[PDB]
Design a protein around this ligand. Structure first.
Ligand SMILES: *[C@@H](O)[C@@H]1CCC(=O)N2CCC[C@@H]2C(=O)NC[C@H](NC(=O)c2cc(C)on2)C(=O)N[C@@H](Cc2ccc(F)cc2)C(=O)N1
Length: 182
């Protein structure tokens, strides 16, 4: 890819991603709008994080759950920083769905911003990730790696999820739904 799907992803990286550092390492963070970022819950962000190496206070944070209290592996952070993110909420789906031909946009743990074609994505339900029940997963068949967490699953004009785990054959993202942010 050097065409539109790659190009949309690179723009998404440049305008709406950052590297979030916690005590658990470096994660790709998705800036949703203004000072709101999402990161995988297992990043366990505290009261201070780094955003692109800059120590930043977390004004508030909260984890998301499904209807039965199962973690979604999404954590929302409101950051104490001057910069505002471009609002990408209109690109986030309203509903769960399957999606053909998706890409993953990676920033953290890569030598340079990286776009990967993960192929077709299905809404997979609940899984066990490192032994923990996790809900509203999107599954793709791609050999993801340890440094991919927080990577943004997308298609042109559609911001679909954030990468939270895998087993070497399959990769999983937490679904982004517009109602989480509105
Ligand atoms: C990013 O922090 C990381 C992404 C890891 C990844 O994509 N990997 C591909 C193969 C090597 C790693 C890996 O270490 N996977 C282990 C585990 N995977 C599973 O449990 C699993 C279940 C099914 C079904 O398919 N894979 C995993 O990915 N763990 C997470 C960390 C995590 C997530 C949620 C929690 F509640 C606790 C811990 C992970 O390592 N993610």
């Amino acid at each position: 890819g050097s065409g539109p799907e790659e190009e949309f992803g690179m723009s998404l990286i440049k305008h709406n991603s950052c590297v979030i550092t916690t005590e658990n390492g470096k994660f790709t963070g998705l800036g949703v709008y203004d000072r709101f970022v999402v990161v995988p819950t297992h990043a366990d962000p505290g009261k201070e994080i780094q955003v692109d190496g800059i120590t930043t206070k977390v004004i508030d944070s909260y984890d998301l759950y499904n209807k039965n209290g199962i973690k979604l592996e999404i954590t929302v952070l409101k950051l104490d920083r001057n910069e505002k993110f471009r609002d990408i909420r209109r690109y986030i789906p309203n509903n769960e769905d399957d999606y053909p031909n998706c890409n993953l946009a990676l920033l953290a743990n890569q030598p340079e911003p990286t776009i990967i074609n993960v192929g077709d994505v299905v809404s997979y339900g609940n899984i066990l990730l490192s032994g923990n029940q996790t809900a509203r997963m999107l599954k793709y068949s791609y050999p993801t790696k340890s440094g991919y967490c927080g990577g943004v699953l997308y298609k042109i004009g559609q911001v679909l999820g954030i990468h939270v785990g895998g087993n070497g054959r399959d990769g999983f993202s937490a679904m982004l739904l517009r109602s989480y942010f509105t």
